[PDB]
Design an enzyme around this catalytic site. Structure first.
Site, PDB file in Angstrom:
ATOM      1  N   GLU A 118      42.331  39.293  50.608  1.00 58.16           N
ATOM      2  CA  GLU A 118      42.633  38.118  49.895  1.00 58.16           C
ATOM      3  C   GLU A 118      42.008  36.867  50.554  1.00 58.16           C
ATOM      4  O   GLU A 118      41.773  35.848  49.921  1.00 58.16           O
ATOM      5  CB  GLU A 118      44.143  38.048  49.736  1.00 58.16           C
ATOM      6  CG  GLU A 118      44.625  37.030  48.680  1.00 58.16           C
ATOM      7  CD  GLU A 118      44.288  37.365  47.241  1.00 58.16           C
ATOM      8  OE1 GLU A 118      45.018  38.061  46.539  1.00 58.16           O
ATOM      9  OE2 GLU A 118      43.239  36.679  46.754  1.00 58.16           O
ATOM     10  N   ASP A 136      43.821  29.589  42.059  1.00 61.64           N
ATOM     11  CA  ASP A 136      43.547  30.982  42.135  1.00 61.64           C
ATOM     12  C   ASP A 136      42.739  31.457  40.904  1.00 61.64           C
ATOM     13  O   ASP A 136      42.159  30.705  40.118  1.00 61.64           O
ATOM     14  CB  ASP A 136      44.885  31.724  42.321  1.00 61.64           C
ATOM     15  CG  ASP A 136      45.725  31.584  41.095  1.00 61.64           C
ATOM     16  OD1 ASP A 136      45.499  30.767  40.217  1.00 61.64           O
ATOM     17  OD2 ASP A 136      46.724  32.434  41.078  1.00 61.64           O
TER      18      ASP A 136
END
Length: 163
Positions: free
Chosen positions: A11, A20
């Protein structure tokens, strides 16, 4: 190798508020701030959590603390999940990390529909079918490597796919 490392690899660790994949404010290791379209909300959220006026920037030390809490949060939730809890109960530390990783990337719910396929990655009887089935996933499609590395961990119970 540990779960912190694994998720930085997967991530990434960002020290500044970012958007995001769905355009939401996030910080550190996928730590979602708010669903609000508003940046200041995101900063209020972030300061409340950090306990200081960060102005959208955090330390490597604060990201990891955030990350630990989130991990403990996922664990709690895993354990409250009818389907997951057991699987989890079973798993060793490494394989647990792989699941928690999925949960992170898709949630308790995304991951509860794999229970089975998950269960079988581990059974010599079904393991090859399980994989196949996982590869037909969107999950794998969108993030092939991450998925690939997640599965090999799950299957192997090692961190080799991470070195």
């Amino acid at each position: 190798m540990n779960i912190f490392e694994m998720l930085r690899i997967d991530e990434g660790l960002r020290l500044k508020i970012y958007k995001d994949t769905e355009g939401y404010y996030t910080i550190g290791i996928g730590h979602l701030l708010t669903k609000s379209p508003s940046l200041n909300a995101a900063k209020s959220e972030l300061d409340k959590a950090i306990g200081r006026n960060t102005n959208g920037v955090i330390t490597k030390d604060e990201a990891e603390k955030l990350f630990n809490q989130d991990v403990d949060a996922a664990v709690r939730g895993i354990l409250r999940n009818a389907k997951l809890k057991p699987v989890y109960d079973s798993l060793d530390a490494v394989r647990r990390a792989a699941l928690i990783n999925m949960v992170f990337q898709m949630g308790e719910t995304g991951v509860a529909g794999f229970t089975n396929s998950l269960r079988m990655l581990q059974q010599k009887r079904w393991d090859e079918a399980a994989v196949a089935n996982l590869a037909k996933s969107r999950w794998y499609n969108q993030t092939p490597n991450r998925a690939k590395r997640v599965i090999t961990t799950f299957r192997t119970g090692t961190w080799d796919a991470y070195k």
